[PDB]
């Protein structure tokens, strides 16, 4: 799963295993993290959710 964020376009705000386009926004005007499922992550300390 994507976990995106909007800087130039809220399609930069992306959850997906499906790709898209951003125009006029890289890092600096995008957002991307790894936000998916299929895991109940029990005891994650030292890297907050």
């Amino acid at each position, epitope marked *: 799963t994507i976990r995106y964020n909007c800087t130039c376009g809220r399609d930069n705000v992306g959850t997906t295993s499906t790709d898209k386009t951003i*125009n*006029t*926004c890289k890092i600096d005007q995008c957002h991307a993290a790894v936000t998916s499922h299929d895991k109940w992550q029990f005891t994650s300390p030292f890297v907050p959710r």
Partner: antibody
Amino acid sequence: QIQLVQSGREVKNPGETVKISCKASGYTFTEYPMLWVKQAPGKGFRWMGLIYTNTGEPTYAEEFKGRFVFSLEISASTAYLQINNLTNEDTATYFCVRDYFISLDYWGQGTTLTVSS
Amino acid sequence: QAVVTQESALTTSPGETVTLTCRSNIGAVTSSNCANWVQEKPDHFFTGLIGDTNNRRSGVPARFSGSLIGDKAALTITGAQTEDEAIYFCALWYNNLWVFGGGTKLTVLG
């Protein structure tokens, strides 16, 4: 759609510095990380770095670590290639470009460099 | 690092156009490496007609085609006329930026 509205063949001292501009006209370099690179004159272009769109800082090329430096005349989303360590072998072209689709989609002008007495 | 092990020249002619099969000195061809044909002329400026491995260029007629071709980047000055030939820089941008490789000098009739 980047056109590097820049300067031309600037000239320098041996070792001294000078900044050749490229303000980005035609397209949106205010979100466009666009090439402001050198020019090795025998082969063509020179990978001297791109300039990120929002912040205005470049990433600098490996052979551009040296002469070309980054600045951001971002009033149209543009920049300028600084020149430090003005060479004996630094006489050569320079270019700009800006587009999408991780290659630079348009190749602007730049200008030549006369690093000589 | 890599090379554009292919046509550093191109062979375009009247009735046709030259597609430089700029073969892989980097690997296989791809649009992710962004193997492009940035066309140029006297006045020395490289300009985009086919890039990113599937994209066309703006202001371009039907004289171009941009992809991976053969076993490398594939740059077609394909539709060479008096307005359809150029010396193209070999677009290589493997998620970084399209800089010059070999680059095929495709001809045209005129």
